[PDB]
A = this chain, B = another copy of it.
């Protein structure tokens, strides 16, 4: 609980950048319930799967399958419009006007936690909390604090595998896997 928060965050983000292809399983706990997903990430490309939904993004084109409709929608999201659900992306707030502090919690041996506090009272989330291991700089949990309501959103990283290699085709939707689906192309 000694080091500088920005330095720890930069080391954590850099190691993620250099990690190659990643497979990250996560759980989201909210007010209203809990759900899990899996993210496969390499460069700007991703695949994300949750119950009844799967999305592929190849760096330009996004395909999103919705099981309850047996429909795949095709689009070209702007960099802001993307929804990778990558918990490591929350580190980037330190460059968008969130002030930082670093401390340490333990009981299980200690981890760092980093507080991110919006300098702008209009921004939502108002605060973000990151729980990061001390030795290996691995993100275990991200908590999001909404400005205008009382309940925290918790994102837990359940498993994290690095150094994967995904073929380009992994990030491109394959209609043969979805024989009955309707394709709805918004491009």
- Residues in A lying within 8 Å of B, measured CB to CB: 1, 4-5, 29, 100-109, 111, 113, 115, 117, 121, 126-127, 129, 131, 140-141, 143, 145, 150-152, 154
Distance in angstroms between the alpha carbons of A134 and B106 in the assembled complex: 15
Q: Is the CB of B150 within 8 A of A103?
A: no
Q: Is the CB of A151 within 8 A of B105?
A: no
Distance in angstroms between the alpha carbons of A106 and B41 in the assembled complex: 26
Task: Quickly give the copy total for this chain.
Answer: 2
Distance in angstroms between the alpha carbons of A175 and B33 in the assembled complex: 62
Q: Is the CB of A152 within 8 A of B105?
A: no
- In the complex formed, the residue of B with least CB distance to A6 is B150
Q: Is the CB of B111 within 8 A of A107?
A: yes
Closest Cβ–Cβ distance, residue A182 to chain B (whole Å): 39
Q: Is the CB of A103 within 8 A of B143?
A: yes
* Given A107-B111, A108-B106, A109-B108, A1-B154 contact (CB < 8 Å): yes
